[PDB]
């Protein structure tokens, strides 16, 4: 078992996909979502380790006979957790979601295919569906327990790297698998980038197809383009954003308090005074938790006005009056 | 409850007046929609989540809520758009000797995310000592068993709780209400209604080029300007009929 070392490459302008299924024409829409950062460092592989999934992954592969036939997603890729297997064979895109004890070396043989040794087990299935020259790009993300898969196929004549061009990525699939996916791996008989929560200024042409986009967080010129809602910026000085130094750390300072508030004497007391003679106790110079009280459900009613119990633990007061 | 059953529903007509009319439901609370308008509406999918909890825990089932069940068993998103129904199950899910079939998770490393289901039975480690699959001090079983006896009070009587979550994405509608589809009329000021998206306009045949996955053509003002007729996949514009000043 041997694996090729990984290289690095420039992402260029790839990673532009319709964030929604709504038709728009000749309008410079602005969106905020998990996009592939422009000019990002995309990992490069040659024909396969277990790549972390993080928060959405952009996959790309240059193929001419469908050498890469599918993908696998999952947290541990064992029977302990669920997993997802996608295989695009011939004209069928078989997608399944079960608990698989994946084989260490998944293999698919061929031209007629007759060898399929990917997983050793398959239990508790939950979903199933059936549907160089060509560059195939896909975008996989998991948001709110929904797995979204966008795709785009282009005709290219190059093997050096990602072509320096612009294109859209139409959606293909959206499923409610609801799987905490943190790892994935392709299937052999490519390039990988990681999405980030960016803001884009997509340009819809006449026929509702994206032609150009501007990564607002890339560089000052792109940010000015986004602020002006335009691609052409005339000579001048434009105010784009605000700059604020973020806090370096956190400082918490409380006095030389040493004791614990005697709240037992007003809660666990054997007897309580009459309501017309409501007993009052002043509490000062002490430290008292408050999540402890609210964690115990023995209280029939617990209503706070002007303060919330969760925010009560981290707070200081001069004196606390307990009336029983 | 920790293993709340989930059902996906699409491609079928569903009424919603039948459930509302019946009074057998102790709790019938809708968020993001009202039952009266629910009949004349469409959705991309419906997810029904069914489970059992005691009455006191019913308050835990609602958007932006906290609690043992809420934090470790079944969490609802803040943007939940659906109806929570609940009725008493003491008549069936109560045993004189204690109904122990239903279990609820009591410990988890973090609060459960919305629509996230776990059935892990690994012994929870409450201390620094690694609980190597052995129950003991600070090594607590993740689940706990409800008593659920008829003799118990109402606050502990079992209840069957269903959560219907309607998801309306930008995809063709597949769950619609018990409303018949009228005949389409074009080039005339009409009060259209597409998949529950009401409005008034002059539906006209359009030359727009919709993509196969697209359903609504929005406008600069977020007004649905082009629509896809579900029965016949053609794109129709929506122009306001006519308006203007009346000078005298």
């Amino acid at each position: 078992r041997t694996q090729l070392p990984p290289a690095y490459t420039n992402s260029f302008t790839r990673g532009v996909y319709y964030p929604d299924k709504v038709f728009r024409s000749s309008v410079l829409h602005s969106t905020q979502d998990l996009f592939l950062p422009f000019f990002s460092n995309v990992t490069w592989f040659h024909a396969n380790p277990v790549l972390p999934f993080n928060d959405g992954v952009y996959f790309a592969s240059t193929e001419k006979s469908n050498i890469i036939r599918g993908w696998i997603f999952g947290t541990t890729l064992d029977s302990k957790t669920q997993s997802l297997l996608i295989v695009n064979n011939a004209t069928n895109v078989v997608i399944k979601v079960c608990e698989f004890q994946f084989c260490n070396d998944p293999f698919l043989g061929v031209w007629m295919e007759s060898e399929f040794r990917v997983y050793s087990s398959a239990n508790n299935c939950t979903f199933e569906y059936v549907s160089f020259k060509n560059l195939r790009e896909f975008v996989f993300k998991n948001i709110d327990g929904y797995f979204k898969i966008y795709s785009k196929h282009t005709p290219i004549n190059l093997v050096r790297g990602l072509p320096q061009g612009f294109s859209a990525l139409e959606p293909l699939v959206d499923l409610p698998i609801g799987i905490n996916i943190t790892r994935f791996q392709t299937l052999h008989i490519y390039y990988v980038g990681y999405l980030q929560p960016r803001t884009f200024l997509l340009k819809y042409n006449e026929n509702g197809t994206i032609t150009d986009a501007v990564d607002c967080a890339l560089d000052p010129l792109s940010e000015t383009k986004c602020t002006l809602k335009s691609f052409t910026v005339e000579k001048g000085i434009y105010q784009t954003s605000n700059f604020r130094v973020q806090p370096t750390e956190s400082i918490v300072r409380f006095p030389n308090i040493t004791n614990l508030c005697p709240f037992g004497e007003v809660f666990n007391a054997t007897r309580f005074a009459s309501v017309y003679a409501w007993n009052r106790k002043r509490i000062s110079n002490c430290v008292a938790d408050y999540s402890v009280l609210y964690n115990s459900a023995s209280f029939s009613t617990f209503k706070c006005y002007g303060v919330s119990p969760t925010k009560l633990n981290d707070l200081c007061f001069t004196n606390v009056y307990a009336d029983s | 409850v920790y293993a709340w059953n989930r059902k996906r529903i699409s491609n079928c007509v569903a009424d919603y007046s039948v459930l509302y009319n019946s009074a057998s439901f102790s709790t019938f609370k809708c968020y993001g929609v009202s039952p009266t308008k629910l009949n004349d509406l469409c959705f991309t999918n419906v997810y029904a989540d069914s489970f059992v909890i005691r009455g006191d825990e019913v308050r835990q089932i609602a958007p932006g809520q906290t609690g043992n069940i809420a934090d470790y068993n079944y969490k609802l998103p803040d943007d939940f758009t659906g109806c929570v129904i609940a009725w008493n199950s003491n008549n069936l899910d109560s045993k004189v000797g204690g109904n122990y079939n239903y279990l609820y998770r009591l410990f988890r490393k973090s609060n459960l995310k919305p629509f996230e289901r776990d059935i892990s039975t690994e012994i929870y480690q409450a201390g620094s000592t690694p609980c190597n699959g052995v129950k003991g001090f600070n090594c607590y079983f993740p689940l706990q068993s409800y008593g659920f006896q008829p003799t118990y009070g109402v606050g502990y009587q079992p209840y069957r709780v269903v959560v219907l979550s309607f998801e309306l994405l930008h995809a063709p509608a597949t769950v619609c209400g018990p409303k018949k589809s009228t005949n389409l009329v074009k080039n005339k000021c009409v009060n259209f209604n597409f998949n529950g998206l009401t409005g008034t306009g002059v539906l006209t045949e359009s030359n727009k080029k919709f993509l196969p996955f697209q359903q609504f053509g929005r406008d600069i003002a977020d007004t649905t300007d082009a629509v896809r007729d579900p029965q016949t996949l053609e794109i129709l514009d929506i122009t306001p009929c006519s308006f203007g000043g009346v000078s005298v």
Partner: antibody
Amino acid sequence: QLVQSGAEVKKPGSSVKVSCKASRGTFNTYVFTWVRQAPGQGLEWMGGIIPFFGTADYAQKFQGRVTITADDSTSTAYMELSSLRSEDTAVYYCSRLSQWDLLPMWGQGTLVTVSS
Amino acid sequence: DIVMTQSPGTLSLSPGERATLSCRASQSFTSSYLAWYQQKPGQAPRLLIYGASSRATGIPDRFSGTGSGTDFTLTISRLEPEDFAVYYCQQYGTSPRMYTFGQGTKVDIKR
């Protein structure tokens, strides 16, 4: 409901460290106290600590030889007694007092023996 | 400090009678509390009265406790064969330094 270390047998002049493990994050906010009792003798308080503050108070008799510490990561209060003698052979207990109840719990007890 | 004295040193009363024990403190409990515990030979101490006036869980109702200031009283309405053991009064509070015990009192069948 506290869990202490098991019964110990030590040579004279040695040291013994008795633990007292606390469940969940109910460690800092409470007050732990170590109390020993020799066989056929009365109850003899030894010391007390508050993990949230970390300062430990000791009985005048036991000053020096004994030391009480507390670790939050393991939620365990430890009491280590040095220069053990036959007089130290006794049953030890850790009692935890809460902020909101006057109901001091007790451990199951731990027998410490110092002899041949 | 605070000194706890228990009286009598050993109480000899027959079963079915009323038992009384007195615990006197060298100083009043300004911010502390008192508890009564029962221990039998070869057995761990058992807490009977917590807060000096509240019976612990499972304690028979015959046991009760009152008092204030520097003096407190533990009372048993009816004496039982299982009730003959050693009794202690312990002063305790939030502050760890408020942890001291009484010398102890023994209850035995009068003969």
